[PDB]
RNA sequence: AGAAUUUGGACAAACUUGGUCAUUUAGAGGAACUAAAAGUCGUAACAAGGUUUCCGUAGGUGAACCUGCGGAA
């Protein structure tokens, strides 16, 4: 059995110079065979007979949906992780803004949700990615909805301490 | 038309010299009203929110990358 991912138009080279990290978690460590197929430019990956191709499929399509290498492999390893994918969804005001209001100035914004609640998350024009435990994904996609949907910065970075803290804390 | 004699002089600034209004009294009294500050340490309070990944153009160019503008997820 197989499985095809597409490679997006930004992602493509990229993958091409670091292609040479991402195969041998594909081959020797999960033990499918790969071949990237320039044409449809996706990826094949089937299985040989020497449920390992969901993961490595997720490896793929992390790299894809454009975490880099180091973090398609911690979602490779470490079972407790997860990626949500959302778009805004929720021109001037309500797009050409709440993204840099999410990002915030050089991307301080993002990085401060990023370290708050131990994810990771790539941001397109519009799309969101985040990656990371279950409550981490939680609190992250929390705090972008709501500021996305209007909320004191003071508020929401308050909440973001408060939420770094509580997520480390025992009991 | 000039000079002095003027022929007869209406006029005349300035200088003495009393009643009028405005101000300075050098000053000095009188007897009214109002007014009158005695409180360590106070802050830096202060203002919006385009990141990543490729692509093209233009320049600075180890044609590597960056920057500016225009695109894609």
Do not use: C
Request: net charge positive.
């Amino acid at each position: 059995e197989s499985r095809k991912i597409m490679v997006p138009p930004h992602r493509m080279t990229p993958l091409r110079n670091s292609w040479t990290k991402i195969y041998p978690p594909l081959v020797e460590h999960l033990k499918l065979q790969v071949r990237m197929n320039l044409k449809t430019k996706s990826v094949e990956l089937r299985t040989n007979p020497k449920g390992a191709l969901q993961k490595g499929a997720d490896f793929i399509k992390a790299f894809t949906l454009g975490f880099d290498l180091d973090d398609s492999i911690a979602l490779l390893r470490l079972d407790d992780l997860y990626i949500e994918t959302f778009e805004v969804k929720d021109t001037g005001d309500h797009l050409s803004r709440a993204i840099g209001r999410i990002a915030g100035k050089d991307g301080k914004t993002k990085f401060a949700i990023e370290n708050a609640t131990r994810t990771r998350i790539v941001l397109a024009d519009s799309k969101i990615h985040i990656l990371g435990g279950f409550t981490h994904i939680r609190m992250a996609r929390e705090s972008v909805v709501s500021l996305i949907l209007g909320s004191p910065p003071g508020k929401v970075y308050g909440n973001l301490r408060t939420v770094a803290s509580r997520l480390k804390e025992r009991y």
